[PDB]
């Protein structure tokens, strides 16, 4: 079946964000995320992962949230963002009944409207907006600039996420 | 100049945790140049490891936050950011070895 993740980031200003999110494995809620930039707390509702494994998963997730906020700050200092704003990140992996060819995704919405999405075939981010703006071109420029935002993001989706589905259904 | 300011903050943390690590190394040298003192070793092993972890987490948090500011500078890149991050991680580790060594010797 599948692993879907939702992340909602509330920016009052460039310096501070409030996170709210959840994850659902095979249609069941499994994880919850809540808190501000400094103290964002991530908990698993079921003991799917052993304490050591889960601690490594949290380290990874917590590093992502620092990095994510950093990118928002850069886009703002370079192209100026209009605050307050809300960023929705909907991502996951879906496994077929037969075959290993898994469908994977990462769609980003800003203030309820489509913004950018990841395309795993070439590990490149694309615009989901009809509007041509400095913010969209710059964000995509940065997103397609690094191995972190490209092959590492794809590896999370195609390997980390998929393996989790295979292990914990 | 954003990243310039942020490197200064990274430096401060390391410089603080360095002087905190030597505050402990001198405690471990005054107790070896001397059973109960042997527990003064567990208390030094504990305070030293707890200190390391804090130092390692606060500094990594700094690096992860300055991912795009440092790599967007132009004469710094992903490889060099990951290089610098490990260069600092191993700088902290080194001090723990300095302390632990004293204890293991005095054993
Ligand atoms: C199977 C997973 C584990 C099971 C647990 C499930 C999760 C439990 C928590 C529930 C809540 C879920 C919500 C969190 C969202 C997803 C977080 C994961 C993202 C992540 O770590 O991806 C890394 C990439 O990060 C980066 O690339 C960092 C930079 C940030 C990119 C931002 C992308 C959107 C751009 C829009 C922002 C700009 C705004 C402009 C107006 C990959 O790394 P990995 O190390 O994990 O890889 C493994 C290979 N070793
Ligand atoms: C993870 O947290 C989510 C918080 O946003 C939430 O998922 C969905 O979020 C949207 C808000 O953007 C809401 O969607 C709509 O749901 C019903 C349709 O059934 C509408 O009548 C509502 O007016 C609302 O706009 C909901 O809050 C929620 N969606 C649903 C279907 O409940 C969930 O709490 C978490 N995700 C899951 C899948 O449980
Ligand atoms: C994301 O959604 C936000 C909520 O809809 C929106 O915030 C609102 O932003 C505008 C402009 O920055 C603020 O209004 C200002 O502009 C009008 C123009 O006629 C002036 O008359 C007002 O005096 C005022 O200065 C709103 O105050 C602000 N809303 C809140 C709750 O503060 C963001 O702009 C949206 N951001 C993006 C990037 O789309
Ligand atoms: C940890 O983060 C939060 C907010 O800064 C603090 O703890 C609580 O965590 C919940 C998470 O849902 C918050 O909504 C609450 O506002 C917090 N307080 C209570 C009474 O529940 C906590 O103080 C932070 N810790 C540190 C050390 O800063």
Pairing mode of beta strands A103-110, A85-94: antiparallel
- Residue A4, token pair as written in the block: 């879907």
Residue A144 Cα to ligand 3 middle (Å) = 29
Pairing mode of beta strands A124-127, A41-44: unpaired
Query: Rounded to the nearest 10 degrees, what angle do helices A51-79 and B39-65 cross at?
Result: 40
Whole-number Å distance between alpha carbons of B15 and B21: 10
Whole-number Å distance between alpha carbons of A17 and A11: 5
Q: How far is CA B25 from the centre of its chain?
A: 13
- A64, closest residue in chain B (CA to CA): B64
- Residue A169, token pair as written in the block: 């259904």
Per-residue burial over B37-47, b if 16 or more Cβ lie within 10 Å, else e, is eeebbeebbeb
Is A34 strand, coil or helix?
A: strand
Q: How far is A26 from chain B (nearest CA, A)?
A: 32
Neighbours of A33 (CB within 10 A): 20
Ligand 1, from A156, A161, A166: best to mutate by most atoms within 8 Å of Cβ? A156
A71-76 long-range contacts, Cβ below 8 Å, gap at least 24?
A: A71/A139, A71/A142, A71/B67, A71/B68, A72/A9, A72/A11, A72/A14, A72/A17, A73/A14, A73/A15, A73/B68, A73/B69, A74/A142, A74/B68, A74/B69, A74/B72, A75/A135, A75/A138, A75/A139, A75/A142, A76/A14
Is A32 strand, coil or helix?
A: strand
Q: How far apart are the first and last CA of chain B?
A: 50
Q: Which residue's structure tokens are 């001198």?
A: B26
- B82, closest residue in chain A (CA to CA): A148
Cis status, amide bond into A84, omega within 30 of 0: yes
Check which CATH number belongs to the domain holding A6 and give it: 3.30.500.10
Structural domain count, chain A: 1
B9-15 long-range contacts, Cβ below 8 Å, gap at least 24?
A: B9/B62, B10/B59, B10/B62, B10/B63, B10/B66, B10/B88, B13/B55, B13/B58, B13/B59, B13/B62, B14/B55, B14/B59, B14/B88, B14/B91, B14/B92
Name every chain A residue with its beta carbon within 8 A of the beta carbon of B66.
70
Whole-number Å distance between alpha carbons of A24 and A2: 8
Query: Rounded to the nearest 10 degrees, what angle do helices B2-30 and B78-106 cross at?
Result: 10
Is B34 strand, coil or helix?
A: coil
Q: In degrees to the nearest 10, what's the CA dihedral of A35, A37, A43, A44?
A: 120
Name every chain A residue with its beta carbon within 8 A of the beta carbon of B2.
77
Model resolution, angstroms: 3.1
Q: Identify the residue whose C-alpha is closest to ligand 4 atom 28.
A: A39
Q: Do B68 and A74 touch (CB under 8 A)?
A: yes
């Amino acid at each position: 079946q599948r692993l879907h993740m939702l992340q909602i980031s509330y920016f009052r200003d460039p310096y501070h964000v409030w996170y709210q999110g959840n994850a659902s494995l095979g249609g069941h809620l499994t994880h919850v995320l809540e808190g501000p930039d400094t103290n964002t707390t991530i908990i698993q509702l079921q003991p799917l992962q052993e304490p050591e494994s889960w601690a490594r998963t949290q380290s990874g997730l917590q590093s992502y949230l620092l990095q994510f906020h950093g990118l928002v700050r850069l886009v703002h200092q370079e192209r100026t963002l209009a605050f307050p704003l809300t960023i929705r990140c909907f991502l996951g992996c879906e496994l077929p009944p037969e075959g290993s060819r898994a469908h994977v995704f990462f769609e980003v919405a800003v203030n309820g409207s489509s913004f950018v999405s990841f395309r795993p075939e070439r590990a490149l981010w694309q615009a989901d907006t009809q509007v041509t703006s400095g913010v969209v071109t710059f964000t995509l420029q940065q997103l397609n600039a690094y191995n972190r935002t490209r092959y590492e993001l794809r590896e999370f989706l195609e390997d980390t996420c998929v393996q989790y589905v295979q292990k914990h259904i | 100049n954003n990243w310039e300011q942020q490197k200064k903050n990274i430096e401060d943390d390391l410089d603080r945790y360095k002087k905190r690590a030597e505050e402990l190394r001198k405690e471990a040298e005054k107790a070896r140049k001397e059973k109960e003192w042997e527990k003064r070793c567990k208390e030094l092993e504990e305070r030293a490891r707890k200190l390391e972890d804090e130092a390692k987490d606060r500094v990594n948090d700094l690096f992860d936050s300055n991912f795009f500011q440092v790599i967007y500078s132009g004469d710094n890149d992903e490889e060099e950011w990951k290089k610098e991050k490990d260069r600092a991680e191993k700088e902290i580790e080194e001090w723990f070895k300095r302390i632990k060594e004293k204890c293991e010797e005095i054993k």
